[PDB]
Amino acid sequence: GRVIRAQRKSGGIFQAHTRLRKGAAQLRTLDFAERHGYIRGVVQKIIHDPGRGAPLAKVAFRNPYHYRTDVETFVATEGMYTGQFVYCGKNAALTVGNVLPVGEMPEGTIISNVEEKAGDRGALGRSSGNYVIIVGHDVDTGKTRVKLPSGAKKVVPSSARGVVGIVAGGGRIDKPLLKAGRAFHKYRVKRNCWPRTRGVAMNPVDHPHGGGNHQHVGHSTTVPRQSAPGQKVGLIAARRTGLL
Amino acid sequence: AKKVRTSTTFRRPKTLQLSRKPKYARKSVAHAPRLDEYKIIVNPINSESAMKKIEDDNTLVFHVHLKANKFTIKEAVRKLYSVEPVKINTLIRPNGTKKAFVKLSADADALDVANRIGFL
Amino acid sequence: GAYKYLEELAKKKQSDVNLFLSRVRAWEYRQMNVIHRASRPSRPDKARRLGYKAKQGYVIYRIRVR
Amino acid sequence: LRPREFARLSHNKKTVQRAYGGCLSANAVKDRIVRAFLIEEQKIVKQKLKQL
Amino acid sequence: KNPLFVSRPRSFGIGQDIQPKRDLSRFVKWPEYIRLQRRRKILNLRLKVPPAIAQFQKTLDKNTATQVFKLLNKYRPETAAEKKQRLVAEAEAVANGKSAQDVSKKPYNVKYGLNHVVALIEAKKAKLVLIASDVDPIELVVFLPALCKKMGVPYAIVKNKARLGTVIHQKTAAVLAVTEVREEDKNELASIVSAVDANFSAKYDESRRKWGGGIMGGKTQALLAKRAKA
RNA sequence: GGACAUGGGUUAGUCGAUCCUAAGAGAUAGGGAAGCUCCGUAUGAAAGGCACGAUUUUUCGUGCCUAUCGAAAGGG
RNA sequence: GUGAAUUUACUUAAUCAAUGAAGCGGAAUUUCUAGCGUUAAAGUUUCGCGAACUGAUCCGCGUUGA
């Protein structure tokens, strides 16, 4: 009889904490220089992004049209160091950290911060230690088959760009937290998503799983995809269930 | 002759902005100066602390208008009593009226000036 | 007068002429604002028979309603 | 000094009599000078090699 | 030939010296009204224009245009100042008690006004009809070529509404009509009738029954041309 | 007697407010809504400047590039 | 909606992605280094940081990409 916690996550106190963020990690806007040649930038500083498991890299490029310096915020790949030169463009070399179109890189290249579509400045393989694999190319259709960190196969335009290398900060999930306090601090810079009360520990007015003399569901916890927002709890549209 | 654009932006052109030339003045008669010296200075203060400031600090204490500032009080005192102040301090009393301490110069005697005003 | 021809032509708004004019006008009216001042009536005889005179003091606005 | 407090100093007290004085350290300026000259020498050599 | 000058050339390749100031007129973020003008022009080119609307795309030739306008400038209507003067002169004539009805002569001038011209065509009094090519609500003139054809009135679609306006001392004229001329201009008129009918009315006709528009471009027709030749 | 009555009493270039921005509020452009009003904050806006010239057909040419409010514990 | 022989294609209507709506379509024809790159100049033709023309091709012009 009450709006449930899942429904209330539409904003307000559930917004992202964004004071200390060091900028939105994006590739260079796809320009003429990066479409037809390459542009060289300098890695100024590797910085910690609060709420992000991977470091960011401040890279300074030259504006090809004006006497000014454009500083771009990248997702740092492993091996990036301050003072390194990073080349972005079609004619860039195949070196770690360089941003090249996926169509110009051979099959099996390890890439990260890959663009879903040409010009959206990076969508895939952005988290720490994650990467995308170039499965193959289809030159006739101008497409590139890639392997995503979830194992899915995806087709992207051959002009979509990707940073060569693996996102830095890998192995970040291996270490156990050991602490509610450390989970508190990790999520304190991300959003209000912690701690989490179980639905079975609630009352019927608060949740489908609430109520009863014993903490149980009473119905199957695998729910359809057509169900209502107040009904989408538990395992939504589960094809398989249970531990294999 | 096709005009060359070197900005990729179109910015609104600057057009002549004529100044106002009304066919009639909206007010027939201009108002008189709403705050003149007779409205700026309301009354002097003759309380015992006011007398003490007069006889030692060479300072005259006046009940003044709320809208009067330090500059207008100095001009009002200069024009109403022909003595130029060297310093002015103001405070809003708890009864809502403004009170001004007017320190006169060594050239002027606050006792004498208080005598000419008549409240001494 | 031509207003008689305008009236009987407006009756035929499933003709190729009116269908083409409907397409181009609907496109350009969407590109303008929801309420925008019309310089002149697009149906001068329809406005004329509804009470519009072509002299100072008469105004035409175009508005699209969902 | 505090930022506004710098405005009361004369020019020489806020600067060092050297290129980029008051902006870069001595070693930073020296690295700028050497790196500029060496890379200009490099591009001259590459221009000589590629012009033929 | 002072040796101090030296060349100092600039290279504007990718990653080289800053690009020079170029014409960027084809990339400007134009105002909304300018985009409306140009995309409306593009839309009329792309779409399939019906025959009754596309017939206004076939206009009078330049040599025929200048000669017909030469005829029209001889029969411009009298200006407001001339009308006032004539009324003043005739009023003095009445005050002096002379023949006011015979002191003046029948006016010879071009006829204008959409309702007036349409009525003249229906009454068979019009000898020549000139239609503005770009009457913004096209329904105002779209029926005129068909009306003139039924009534046997020679008609032409001339360039631009403003030229017809300046003939009749206005900003705009949707259509002009010549109904009577002077004997010295009978031959020039008849030549204009013959040229207009031959090139525009006796010709086309099969064209005014055909569909206009449908022109693709500018790079898609190059795309199709490349695909066809390959 | 912090009660009752009568008077008196708070003086700033330097202490704060004012200035700045924070989370956040909130116009404008626009779009919704029968409407009260809602959303929106550089967005699908023509969103403003600065400099040179024997004065140029004594009818101006040639160049170059974001409100506001919100801290008497923050900044100053 | 427009075509070409259910089969293919096109884009101007609508949808999505990017930006400071910079180099789109045709034709003619910058990688050993954490440095600096602006406030054109040589060339040509008139008459000193006065000009012009190119330097810095032309054309189309649909801001690009899906």
- Which subunits count as partners of chain C given 3+ CB pairs below 8 Å? E
CA distance readout (Å), A231 to A204, B106, B114, E89: 13, 89, 88, 95
* Residue among E199, E161, E204 at smallest CA distance from E60: E199
CA distance readout (Å), E186 to B13, E182, E193: 52, 6, 10
| β-pair partners for A58 | A45, A73
B with E: 3 or more CB pairs under 8 Å?
yes
Sheet holding A132-138, edge to edge: A69-75, A55-62, A38-48, A85-89, A99-101, A161-164, A110-112, A132-138, A143-147, A153-157
A201 residue type, one letter: A
* Residue among B111, B94, B100 at smallest CA distance from B37: B100
Report DSSP state, residue E29: B
E20 shares contact with chain B (CB less than 8 Å)? no
Chain C residue with minimal CA distance to E144?
C2
CB of B63 lies under 7 Å from some atom of strand F: no
Q: In whole angstroms, give the CA distance from residue A117 to residue A102.
A: 11
Give strand letter and number of the nucleotide nearest B12 (CA to C1'): F46
Q: In whole angstroms, give the CA distance from residue B65 to residue B99.
A: 8
Dihedral pair phi/psi, residue E118, rounded to 5° = -60, -40
| β-pair partners for C63 | C35
C27 residue type, one letter: W
Q: Rg (Cα) of chain C, in Å, rounded?
A: 13
Q: Rg (Cα) of chain E, in Å, rounded?
A: 27
Which is it for the CA torsion A231, A232, A234, A237, positive or negative?
Answer: positive
User: What crossing angle do the helices spanning B70-81 and B110-117 adopt, rounded to 10°?
Assistant: 70
* Residue among A92, A93, A52 at smallest CA distance from A76: A52
B49 shares contact with chain E (CB less than 8 Å)? no
Written as six digits, the tokens of E225 are 């041309």
CB of C64 lies under 7 Å from some atom of strand G: no
Q: Work out the minimum CA distance from E44 to partner chain C, whole angstroms.
A: 8
| CA–C1' gap, C63 and F17, in angstroms | 51
Q: In whole angstroms, give the CA distance from residue E180 to residue E125.
A: 8
| CA–C1' gap, A199 and G15, in angstroms | 40
Can you give the three-state secondary structure of chain A, one letter per residue? CCCCCCCCCCCHHHCCCCCCCCCCCCCCCCCHHHHHCEEEEEEEEEEECCCCCCEEEEEEEECCCCCCEEEEEEECECCCCCCCEEEEECCCCCCCCCEEEHHHCCCCCEEECECCCCCCCCCECCCCCCCEEEEEEECCCCEEEEECCCCCEEEEECCCEEEECCECCCCCCCCCCCCHHHHHHHHHCCCCCCCCCCCCCCCCCCCCCCCCCCCCCCCCCEECCCCCCCCCCCEECCCCCCCC
Q: Determine the 3-state secondary structure of E113 from DSSP.
A: coil
Chain B residue with minimal CA distance to E20?
B6
Q: In whole angstroms, give the CA distance from residue B83 to residue D17.
A: 57
In terms of C-beta density within 10 A (0-12 exposed, 13-18 middle, 19 or more buried), how is residue D38 classed?
exposed
Task: Give the ranges where E75-136 is alpha helix by DSSP (H).
Answer: 80-95, 100-103, 114-122
Q: In whole angstroms, give the CA distance from residue D43 to residue D34.
A: 14
Q: How many CB atoms lie within 10 A of CB A56?
A: 21
Residues in Cβ contact with C1 at an 8 Å cutoff, skipping those fewer than 6 apart: E114, E115, E118, E119
Residue with tokens 């008669």: B29
Q: CA angle B15-B17-B19, nearest 5°?
A: 165
Written as six digits, the tokens of E101 are 């009805």
Q: In whole angstroms, give the CA distance from residue C14 to residue B18.
A: 51
Half-sphere exposure of E140 (CA within 13 A, CB side): 23
Q: In whole angstroms, give the CA distance from residue E194 to residue E112.
A: 22
Residue with tokens 């199709």: E224
Q: How many CB atoms lie within 10 A of CB A29?
A: 10
Q: Are A89 and A40 in contact (CB under 8 A)?
A: no
| Helix H or strand E encompassing B66 | none
Q: Are D20 and D29 in contact (CB under 8 A)?
A: yes
Dihedral pair phi/psi, residue A223, rounded to 5° = -120, 155
CB of A65 lies under 7 Å from some atom of strand G: yes
Written as six digits, the tokens of A163 are 């940073």
Say how many Å lie between the first and final Cα of chain C, rounded.
Answer: 36
* Pairing of β A110-112 and β B85-92: unpaired
Q: In whole angstroms, give the CA distance from residue E205 to residue B41.
A: 96
Out of E22, E29, E34, closest to residue B6 by CB: E22
Instruction: Identify the residue whose Cα has the smallest distance to the C1' of G65.
Output: A118
Which is it for the CA torsion B62, B64, B70, B72, positive or negative?
Answer: negative
Q: Determine the 3-state secondary structure of B120 from DSSP.
A: coil
**DSSP per residue, D1-52:** --TGGGGGS-GGGG--SSTTTTTS-HHHHHHHHHHHHHHHHHHHHHHHHHH-
Q: Is the peptide bond prior to A195 cis by the omega test (within 30 degrees of 0)?
A: yes
Q: Are E164 and E113 in contact (CB under 8 A)?
A: no
Residues in Cβ contact with C49 at an 8 Å cutoff, skipping those fewer than 6 apart: C7
Residue with tokens 């400045």: A121
Give strand letter and number of the nucleotide nearest B59 (CA to C1'): F11
From chain E, the residues in CB contact with B5 under 8 A are 23-25, 28
Contact call for C28 and E139, based on CB within 8 A:
no
Q: Which nucleotides of F are covered by protein (CB under 7 A)?
A: 7-12, 22-24, 30-34, 45-49, 63-65, 76
| CA–C1' gap, B94 and F9, in angstroms | 9
The Cα diameter of chain C in Å comes to 36
Q: Determine the 3-state secondary structure of B19 from DSSP.
A: coil
C17 shares contact with chain E (CB less than 8 Å)? yes
Q: How many CB atoms lie within 10 A of CB E153?
A: 21
From chain B, the residues in CB contact with E24 under 8 A are 5-8
Q: In whole angstroms, give the CA distance from residue C22 to residue C34.
A: 17
CA distance readout (Å), B104 to A153, A195, B84, B109: 92, 72, 6, 7
| Helix H or strand E encompassing E65 | helix E62-74
CB of E106 lies under 7 Å from some atom of strand G: no
Task: Give the ranges where C3-55 is alpha helix by DSSP (H).
Answer: 3-10, 16-31, 44-50
Written as six digits, the tokens of B107 are 């050239």
* Residue among E203, E183, E188, E206 at smallest CA distance from E64: E188
Residues in Cβ contact with E143 at an 8 Å cutoff, skipping those fewer than 6 apart: C2, C5, C9
Q: Are A113 and A162 in contact (CB under 8 A)?
A: yes
Give one word for A232, left, alpha or beta, with left for phi > 0 and alpha for psi -120 to 50.
beta
Length of chain D: 52
* Residue among A121, A117, A38 at smallest CA distance from A74: A121
CA distance readout (Å), E114 to B30, C44, E119: 57, 12, 9
Q: In whole angstroms, give the CA distance from residue E155 to residue C54.
A: 28
E-interface mutation test, from B2, B3, B6, most E Cβ less than 10 A away: B6
Written as six digits, the tokens of E149 are 């054809």
C with B: 3 or more CB pairs under 8 Å?
no
| β-pair partners for C61 | C37
Which of D's residues 1-52 have CB atoms within 7 A of nucleic strand G?
Answer: 31-32, 35-36, 38-43, 46
Q: How many CB atoms lie within 10 A of CB E150?
A: 10
Out of E40, E43, E142, closest to residue C17 by CB: E142
Written as six digits, the tokens of A138 are 């289809």
Residue with tokens 């030939």: E1
Q: Is the peptide bond prior to A53 cis by the omega test (within 30 degrees of 0)?
A: no
D48 residue type, one letter: K
Written as six digits, the tokens of C20 are 């083409």
* Residue among E183, E163, E182, E159 at smallest CA distance from E173: E163
Out of A39, A66, A67, closest to residue E15 by CB: A39
Residues in Cβ contact with A86 at an 8 Å cutoff, skipping those fewer than 6 apart: A40, A41, A42, A43, A59, A74, A80, A97, A98, A99
* Pairing of β A99-101 and β A161-164: antiparallel
Q: In whole angstroms, give the CA distance from residue A63 to residue A33.
A: 10
Residue with tokens 């007398």: B51
| CA–C1' gap, B83 and F10, in angstroms | 27
* Residue among E90, E95, E101, E161 at smallest CA distance from E131: E161
User: What crossing angle do the helices spanning E32-46 and C16-31 adopt, rounded to 10°?
Assistant: 160
